[PDB]
Amino acid sequence: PSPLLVGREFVRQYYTLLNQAPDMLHRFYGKNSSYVHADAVYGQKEIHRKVMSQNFTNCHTKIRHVDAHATLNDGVVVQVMGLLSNNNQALRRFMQTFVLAPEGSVANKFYVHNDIFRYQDEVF
Template identity: 75%
Template sequence: MVMEKPSAQLVGREFVRQYYTLLNQAPDYLHRFYGKNSSYVHGGLDSNGKPVEAVYGQSEIHKRVMALSFRDCHTKIRHVDAHATLNEGVVVQVMGELSNNMQPMRKFMQTFVLAPEGTVANKFYVHNDVFRYQDEVFGDSDSEPPEGGRFSFVLRWLYRPYQPCR
């Protein structure tokens, strides 16, 4: 019997259900979604005002999750987008609100890249995870951020003039 491959949307929605349930009920096991080459970044700026660095690998991710002290964490998921990506992976973007340790709800955006795990059909792990609170990105007003308050860059593509094949 051949199992039908689930859609990226189905994989994404099921992953989101499992991930945020575990975040609420047992955050100390959250690192088990990740692998030895996974990356994880949570937040915007550290206490020195510098961008939070990503951590790599299941062990370091576990330490970072524990340092975030998730307690009585509740989420309201507003929207989930999921799309197939390279090598049978799935990219998932989650928009919602999160409350940790009885604090007020804060809007967030979280993006996951789910990669297939080995040769087991329909089994994935989190290869990349980027979490941002929206108030840390956009602030509370419509005004422009102060000079030096945000960083930006210009991506310049390498342009090569057309050369006919010989």
């Protein structure tokens, strides 16, 4: 399984679903999953709540670069650099770090174990 291709494809599903139906975003994750976007919320239920607390509506993303390498235990770690615009607003730079774990049983199936988002402007 090729990390770059996995990573490009996840990236395309995730951001696309962020624009189209953020209420479904919770399905990329598993029971152990960590979400950070300020403590980290864990698991699907709390991630759905936190996703929905952010009120994403026609949220657009401009993806400038994706790095995706093999990680321990057949996983894939992904760093994404891009710009984000919620609800017709100004685009703001961010980075997002995902860790994608093979779902174990099923072939070519993965889930999001980690998701760490941070705006540049909230740091510099």
